[model samples]
Target chain A: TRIKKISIEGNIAAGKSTFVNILKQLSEDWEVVPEPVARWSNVELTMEQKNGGNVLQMMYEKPERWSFTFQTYACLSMIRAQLASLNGKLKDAEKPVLFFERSVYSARYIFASNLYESESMNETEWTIYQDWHDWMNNQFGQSLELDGIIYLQATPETCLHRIYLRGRNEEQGIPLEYLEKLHYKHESWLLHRTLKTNFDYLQEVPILTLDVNEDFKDKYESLVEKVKEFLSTL
Target chain B: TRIKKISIEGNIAAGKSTFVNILKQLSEDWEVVPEPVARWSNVQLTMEQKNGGNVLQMMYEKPERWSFTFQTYACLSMIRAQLASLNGKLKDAEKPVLFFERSVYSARYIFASNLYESESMNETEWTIYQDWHDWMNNQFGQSLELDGIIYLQATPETCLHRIYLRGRNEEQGIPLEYLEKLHYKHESWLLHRTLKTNFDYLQEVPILTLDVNEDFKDKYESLVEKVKEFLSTL
Candidate 1:
């Protein structure tokens, strides 16, 4: 059987990691690829680094200074994750679904587009970002394509509460307003599907929106059933 | 009787001027406000023009430089046109409708958005443009609202042919690709109503899509009749 590529897209602190864990427990027929947070926080290409110095935090604190850099890194890192997940899949594997934390599409449309909208990234930076985004998508072919997107649709308030509980230092400066803005971007891209940056192929991908305003941990069993229902349609 | 405000929206050279003239001939109860072309080309705002140097032309040639300036001017000018058409009408008069060539909505969503999509306007310029756009809409209240939009839908090729026949010196630099890009923007905003810049109130406005790939001038009588039918519904 062929693998069904699925992406779990959501706002920051939307419990994506937990959702993946829940699904993994329920079924062995799924391979998970987590977000490449280490790339943002610690990785250095060839030449070493005493300290990579967390570009994610830099972006959070001074968006105008580090948005472009962070977005570029996030985009490339996402593609790497996508490629590894797809390549690691076996042709006749029992786990016939490859689940990823996020996709390159969200990295560009939601994060990068929001940064530009907030005036954090200049037009030149945005254009350069978009050019490479389109080129990479073109080159990657079906590897970048998703069978479905599992959108953890939560309100900004819910996301903020989760962020507070998690207490990631990079997210400390993330105010409610920032979450609200990112929520709008996600809603426009995935829910409403009205953003201009949504390429034609992206518009065709089916989205299964799961409301996670309330705690999802207790309802993981029900959530997995719903996801199974969603997968059947594809 | 209350006035029914209608904005005739179309691609460049989609026979908006001809359509307006035909409607004027058919009915005196309609007050037509033409597009502010003079403001774009000549008038120096009481300062005598040694040469205002057509910004429209400059924008066409060096869009990267002049797009934001022309778009800002176009937006403000369209607003002025909207206000005059709204305020100039008599409270208890025979004429019960005001027809404008274009509106502030098109200026921002269609033109400015197209420029931004084309990488002509940078993120900073686009953000600044959007801030004032939303601000102007907020301050104008219902005056900026449209009862209905008359979309003269024509293919890009049709628009190009008409442009060539009209032979305006400034329009000489316009290529089919440019027209196609602008056409896509118009289609997205008016036809599909899918652009992110489309405000909530604007979404509620009714649109009358008129296919005008053929010569509309030859069928002006029938066109005016269709417009009257469209106005009746509004």
Candidate 2:
């Protein structure tokens, strides 16, 4: 009756959700927790001036004021969403497989890379940000367990094309440099020694890296097979 | 004509800015860079929703979806603001003293505490958050040079009272548990070995711990005199 929790991680438009949907449809025994994007979309934009749209614009205009606040709130939101998603079920679940559309870890990767690339944040600011990161880890240090991460690797060009195709308004003004930086960070962190050490520190979750630049349907099938393979071993 | 950049750090509503204003008005030679709280106040409510407010609320309601997304974004916003406050003219000033309402390093303390207190985040999320922290430090590690941090030490009871007196609408619904957790993290991180290492990593800045719970105005004067003494020795 032990549940197997698996996460899919990648940059935006890297076929994460698509792959998850494929896995769910293909496997009758598997249950997929859809990414929070759809749920996020359904929420009424209550906090007008500080909403996501204005926050991004504000970050672009005065990144100093909005960036840290924006990033902090985002991390908290992700944590909250994650908690909600897995609360009752995770604590007492009989399902053998649980697949998440995206992992919370991806948020950390995106934020760190964005700040480092911006060349705007100072050492003091960086240190403060680090503390928040540490706090997050310390909070969830006990409950969650992961078998492995299914990472979707893609080039900036590919990601850009996909982003354009999806066409979310928020994705419009996002600069190439920003997206590229995010991709770079995503790849680097996945392969970095320090990050590996961090992974060891938190949990010994295996990571299955997959390139999503090729055929989408093939890629989807490959990912599903790989996850199943990992789960079977576990 | 070297400018001395001093930071006042403490838990939320610990009278850091209040004391900064007092000193700014009292001394003509000293320039105070106020905290970005006003600007933050201008953005937080709206921004919270836009960047996944419903998800965040739901997570808090559910306590399982705590992800790196929420924490990282908040840190990014705070770090960006801290960098903006510390860079450029302030970095190269000729004044004998410069005062910051809050130190950039303070973010680490607050976030670390939040991480420990919040039971929502998972292990993978925590690891990702830590990796982001390490990456952030490497990227902007040289910008902060603190002469000394003026630590406004106070208990949660006092902090809660001050936060209440501030009278922001956002403060209305904030739980007492959150404030207590904030204080606990602030104390542990601020006074811990890790914080000491952070000070060493950032050029060994001395800290002037002021117990504001006693005589608030007297502690203010004492902090100022301590700064003057430190400057004399310099």
Candidate 3:
């Protein structure tokens, strides 16, 4: 089991977990490590601050009060643990494969960088987060070499619609403006590499970007097949 | 048992656990928690990476190859779990007084900050770790209020001497220069409060700084008496 760790990345309503879950069902031996969203919320919240909910929602509603960088720290920790546990269990003779839903890469490029772009975090805050990404990247170096990443691309419009359907109260009142901005952030990050740096590892990872907005209801099987084909290449 | 949370802050080999062990022996009511050095290390190590050993020492020896910030992410999770499990069993605690060798406070201010300052972490890395501290502080704000902090003061020279006397193969080749730098960092963080930010809670805690370089052999009773006096006020 040659352990290959790949991250599934996308914008907030971008079908990351959904896509990863399906892949998990298809592959029994692979390790499927989901994002630690509920764990951090206190799994606690204020959805609308409607008396209280997920801490993440609290962050969404009030970035200043709830904390973007703080959440980043917690999320990265969870991701680290998930990766370590699965990685250690990986077969040394034949490395295994681990499907990760959102990783430190997304946590930095897609998520925190988005906050910095939106001016949600001040210059100092952004600098700190950026430095963390670099340092961690250095530390992660070869030990956590990513095999591949699946980016489920989605539009602002589709993302909102999906978010609306999913209806987590903490996700309520999320402005299309924010969603639209994040969509581009994801676009620029994984595709454009606008957030690229001298020591950035992002430029190196093999990425498979799928149009998540494409109608999946009628063509779910075909889409799954496409994904299967993509994974097989790695 | 409304247990109190106290931190025993010190440099490497500054007698954090030794002092704590004694206190626990003297007081049946208190729960003394030691630092999870072995827990974080993979628990075993050779100072040099020529063979291979614990993750922590690797970070120490070849930080360029390993990671400090990366290690921070993992270490804090373990600390959080350790604190939570111990805290939960504190019988609502009254809460009871639990003596912890180190807490997240020291993790951020002394350990991580020193790394940042040392350029072991670049500016970006430093900021991320700092942001984590603020974020964690925000979350742990009300619930994890400290009853007091016991700062074990020691000079870099003394710290080196103690480390040498201890003879732990895990800590070999630990340069005096590094200890000197960290000694000042510990001093400034706990005493001078140089690391203090507007939101920094280190200012609020009652601090008992004892010159750990003193002859504990002769003044053991006096030192314990001093500690008892400090806890009484808390």
Candidate 4:
């Protein structure tokens, strides 16, 4: 029997990491898959806080060469998380749950799709990625299927402000237009369900959209209550 | 157990119909699925040979409107042929064989892809069709898998000449450039195996390329012998 799997989907700086921390505090049996940033950045040396080749930073700096590479790596890491959660046993509670920072679906549909649309990733790269993606979906079957999605909805302006406040060095170069495009991708997938690809698989996966345009501190209780109610229904 | 299923792949007028007829006459146990031209053209009157709404012709004339629709219908018809052949039993020889004029792979990889690449079918339509295509592949699995492809290689000029000689009224408007584009689609798929999609599914599916630039009457024996040898190995 597969455990319940849920995903937290949103734009960058949408407080997903912060939200996951809160959710982690709420339950002991919950297995959380944090976004694979350290893997992406190759942060090896812990004591000296040293970093190796940073794919994330490279992607932000030169997208033409790195967009496809970065997306592929992201997809690989996300799939690993999914496999680990689906196959492993959880400790503590009788009813266990697996919460992931992002999903392979969003990795392909949002970031990879945006790269292709924005001409950062060419047609050949996009099609090649899609081929493997479809292959993975067919190979893995229900193991990768999501039970639901928690959408942290925020305007581009709010996301930009959050990015600045968070002080991620690589994210400093991210322009307003970039955030707007990502915001659009999020809306099309979660809010409007208007992506070009038939998101029919996602149709059954329930979505709980929380307005995170305001600071997370302002709506901490409300956020937890809404998410708890959503999880109960599932 | 599934029979040895082979597809006759080529550009628009690359002697696929002629080749299928020849292959059909070679053995009694061989079941041939002809192209779904009748369904596409909607020719109802048998005695008078009447035609209703020719999608093939419409696609050539107004591609922007009909490319997506025609590709979808073509895929459906080809899938029907695949299912019928995969499930049905054949008579005569100890070993049964299935030969199809075209496969669903070409309908998507060649025609639908061209329509999208040429900007005839918009991104949304292409993606929707792709979603369903991927879904069908997932659902049908091995039933839709091909054992081999017999590619009728012909130059655009030769294809154009054949089109003129064949006297397909709908094909009269087809320019040399159109045939050239389709020829590239075929070469990338069969000869070079350079299509953007992984095409790894087709890695083991043997392909036999036969030059059909000249008239079929000239090299009838050679074609049959080559194809027979190819089928024997499979």
Arrange candidates, best TM-score first. 3, 4, 1, 2
Order the candidates by lDDT, highest first.
4, 1, 3, 2
Fnat for the candidates in order: 0.00, 0.00, 0.08, 0.00
Interface RMSD of 3: 13.6
The alpha-carbon deviation from the true structure for residue B78 of candidate 1, after best TM-score superposition, in angstroms, is 1.7
Model 2, residue B147: what's the lDDT?
68
Ranking by DockQ: 3, 2, 4, 1
**Index of the highest-TM-score prediction:** 3
Q: lDDT tens string, model 3, A102-207?
A: 7776676666766777777755345535654654445343456567877788888888898898788767678898888778877776787675744445588777
Model 1 TM-score is 0.48
Worst 10 residues of 4 chain A by lDDT: A43-52
lDDT of 3 by residue, B1-234 (tens): 257778788999888877877787666567776675534434423222211234455577756433443445444443554456455655643436778777777776667666666667654445555554554445444455577888888888888888888777767688999888788878787778777753545578788889888647545788888977887887
Q: What number of backbone clashes does candidate 2 have, counting pairs of residues 3 or more apart or in separate chains?
A: 47
**Residue-level error in angstroms, candidate 1, position B182:** 1.7
Candidate 1, residues B1-234, lDDT tens digits: the string is 277788899999988887877776555677777786534454324211111235566666778866765675555556665676677754565647778898887877777887898899766557656654664466463665778889998998999989889887678668899888888888888887787654677787888888889896776667677877888887
Instruction: Point out where model 3 deviates above 4 Å.
Output: A1-234, B38-53, B92-95, B215-219
Candidate 1, CAPRI quality class derived from DockQ: incorrect
Question: What lDDT does the true structure give each of the candidates?
Answer: 0.73, 0.59, 0.65, 0.74
B1-234 per-residue lDDT for model 2 (tens digits): 256667777877778877887877665566777654334443324442234343344334545443344455555555555455555444544454677776556654465435634655544345445545554554453454566667788887787777788876566566677777766655665565354434354435666777777546555677667767766654
Q: What's the iRMSD of model 1?
A: 16.9
- What's the TM-score, to 2 decimals, of chain B in model 3? 0.82
